Design a binder for this molecule. Structure first.
Ligand SMILES: Cc1cc2nc3c(=O)[nH]c(=O)nc-3n(C[C@H](O)[C@H](O)[C@H](O)COP(=O)(O)OP(=O)(O)OC[C@H]3O[C@@H](n4cnc5c(N)ncnc54)[C@H](O)[C@@H]3O)c2cc1C
Ligand SMILES: Cc1cc2nc3c(=O)[nH]c(=O)nc-3n(C[C@H](O)[C@H](O)[C@H](O)COP(=O)(O)OP(=O)(O)OC[C@H]3O[C@@H](n4cnc5c(N)ncnc54)[C@H](O)[C@@H]3O)c2cc1C
Ligand SMILES: O=C(O)c1cc2sccc2[nH]1
Ligand SMILES: O=C(O)c1cc2sccc2[nH]1
Lengths: 340, 340
């Protein structure tokens, strides 16, 4: 009963934990190893603000809306716990700004107190003429990743610093089940032309008077490419850079400018806020998440592979529902093998 | 014209600013001095969290609701102003929690996006069965008082550290108009049987993940005597203590425990918060604010006095509408001295 999880971002970590809680037994022990090239604070998960917000429009797969709703409901149950702070979990309200009356999102009833913005509220954002206000949740990846690791290490899970070259390399060493949570890099283990980097740049600023998230939406700039302000526990994330096919890990100076000028125009009080840091990450962009089983067609034994990658700009938002689905796929592997 | 403003809390400073910006001219040159025994951070204004919220039910004087509304409208028009950070001015959303249903407040349309709490939002507060959600403003005194002081200084207003023994002592040194903004200590200059300290105690805690205010209402505890959580710029104010007639300036453990126990039950995450500081202050409690002119008959001349005190637990909420009214009374004085 040897299981190897490839990846230590929110995907692999929550998957490892979910499989362990649901399938570990002293009767039938479950050996679980996590192999990863990069760990916290150096994953894509660490670059995220951690705000819960799926895409505005209905997903290519309606199963994704269920996975996001299951994640919200799960995080909402731990929000008023003493453990909440160790997770990087907290409630936050905020604004979604538009230039037109776009349709209501499928998640209007999952979030708390969703409503349209009133005239006086919109008078605060002269560049926008429609929007929403609701209460959502922030799950900060750097705390959540450390918390998941702590809970994994105490459940018997060993962590290994390694760049996996092939699934067959892992299959050869005895892995019965391979959990593929490689994010944006998955194409290195198996070609997937639907998987692309969604290059992102963010600024971390000191603006503690900022109690609300502010997200803007422009068709001319596209998804995740217009100003956003997201207050964290210690700092405020400034963003709004999406570049499909861009693999540059360096901080582009025109992007730094776009972030600064766009966010200051959105919220003039940012102009006097102290810039703390700047980061680049690659969103694992895909028309839909890949969350399925694959029987390896290489080597003398067939190896069971659970793929869990391609969560684009909403991995923190959907991680739990995806972890639970991967655990379901895992139990299906267990039954098909044998009972007695 | 020689003006002496007694008091350097929010009332004294905003009145002095409002009078100077409206009346100092070539036609009416004003010599304004401010006398105060205590300056920031040692005034009642400094103990306050600075949240804008008047009384729920219609005031004894309907003028008070107009004065609070004028204050919110003025502060709201500056929320994105270059000076907002210097003022300590920012937007904040939050909860007003009740055991039973209560009528909508007279200010429901002054605040932003006022509405009732939904069942899912109410499930987060088991001890309460009814509530509101709205967006208001915080104006922090430690910043606001220093901002008003800098504004008065550039206008040529002179500040003196002194404990005024009597209005006559001021009148005898040449004051034409005395603006009495002495807060809870006004009785020492002229007996006021309707003025009492509304003793308050607060804790300032490090809980930066707290993004909303939470105010609880209990008619058995009375006004300002039920737990409240008010996130500021650097710290979160924990309070909920009102002791009518208590002149003790010391912080006490009983009140420390009431605050801590009450606010931790409301928000379990507070258990792990670091306590930064604790303060005691005296709300200037009266059945209504005394904002009126008086011709003082103590000495060879009559001195024109403007009283502006008795703002209770809502001095920050109402200060600007009161400062504008004091200025109108000041104009009536100049108009009588046959020089306007
Ligand atoms: C700028 C920006 C802002 C964002 N904001 C939000 C937000 O507010 N809310 C939200 O829900 N989402 C947000 N996201 C998306 C979120 O960051 C990602 O969807 C989530 O981090 C992807 O999770 P992951 O586990 O798949 O990838 P990662 O965190 O990238 O983990 C991939 C893991 O796979 C490992 N790995 C890959 N290949 C191999 C190999 N061959 N061998 C060994 N290890 C390997 C890596 O080392 C790493 O451990 C944001 C993204 C960006 C870029
Ligand atoms: C615990 C607590 C929390 C609160 N929270 C809020 C809130 O969130 N929002 C809100 O709107 N309000 C709040 N308040 C109300 C606000 O603090 C007071 O209404 C406002 O501070 C009253 O201001 P003031 O100018 O009249 O008095 P103060 O701020 O006390 O200043 C009185 C001034 O007069 C001076 N003075 C008095 N007598 C003399 C004399 N004889 N000679 C020389 N100088 C003299 C003092 O030295 C001082 O400079 C709160 C109050 C308390 C106690
Ligand atoms: O840039 C992103 O990928 C991103 C910004 C926000 S705000 C909520 C989710 C999310 N994702
Ligand atoms: O304790 C007080 O006097 C007080 C608490 C709050 S919250 C808004 C006003 C106000 N006043």
């Amino acid at each position: 009963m040897r299981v190897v999880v490839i990846g230590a971002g929110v995907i692999g970590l929550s998957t490892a934990l979910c499989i362990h809680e649901r399938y570990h037994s002293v009767l039938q022990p479950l050996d679980i190893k996590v192999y990863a090239d990069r760990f916290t604070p150096l994953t894509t998960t660490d670059v995220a603000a951690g705000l819960w917000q799926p895409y505005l429009s209905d997903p290519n797969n309606p199963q994704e809306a269920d996975w996001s709703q299951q994640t919200f409901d799960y995080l909402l149950s731990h929000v008023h716990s003493p453990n909440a702070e160790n997770l990087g979990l907290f409630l936050i309200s905020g604004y979604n700004l538009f230039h037109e009356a776009i349709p209501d999102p499928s998640w209007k009833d999952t979030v708390l107190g969703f409503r349209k913005l009133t005239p006086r509220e919109l008078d605060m954002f002269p560049d926008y003429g429609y929007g929403w206000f609701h209460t959502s949740l922030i799950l900060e990846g750097k705390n959540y990743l450390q918390w998941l690791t702590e809970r994994l290490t105490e459940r018997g899970v060993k962590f290994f610093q390694r760049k996996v070259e092939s699934f067959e390399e892992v299959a050869r060493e005895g892995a019965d089940v391979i959990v593929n949570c490689t994010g944006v890099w998955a194409g290195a283990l198996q070609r997937d032309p639907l998987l692309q980097p969604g290059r992102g740049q963010i600024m971390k600023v000191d603006a503690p008077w900022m109690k609300h998230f502010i997200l803007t939406h422009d068709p001319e700039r596209g998804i995740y490419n217009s100003p956003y302000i997201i207050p964290g526990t210690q700092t405020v994330t400034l963003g709004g850079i999406f570049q499909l096919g861009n693999w540059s890990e360096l901080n582009n100076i025109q992007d730094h400018n776009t972030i600064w000028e766009g966010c200051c125009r959105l919220e003039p009080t940012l102009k006097n806020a102290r810039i703390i840091g700047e980061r680049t990450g690659f969103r694992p962009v895909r028309p839909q998440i890949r969350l399925e089983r694959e029987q390896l067609r290489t080597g003398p034994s067939n190896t069971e592979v659970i793929h869990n990658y391609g969560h684009g700009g909403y991995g923190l938002t959907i991680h739990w529902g995806c972890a639970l689905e991967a655990a379901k796929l895992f139990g299906r592997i267990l039954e098909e093998k044998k009972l007695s």
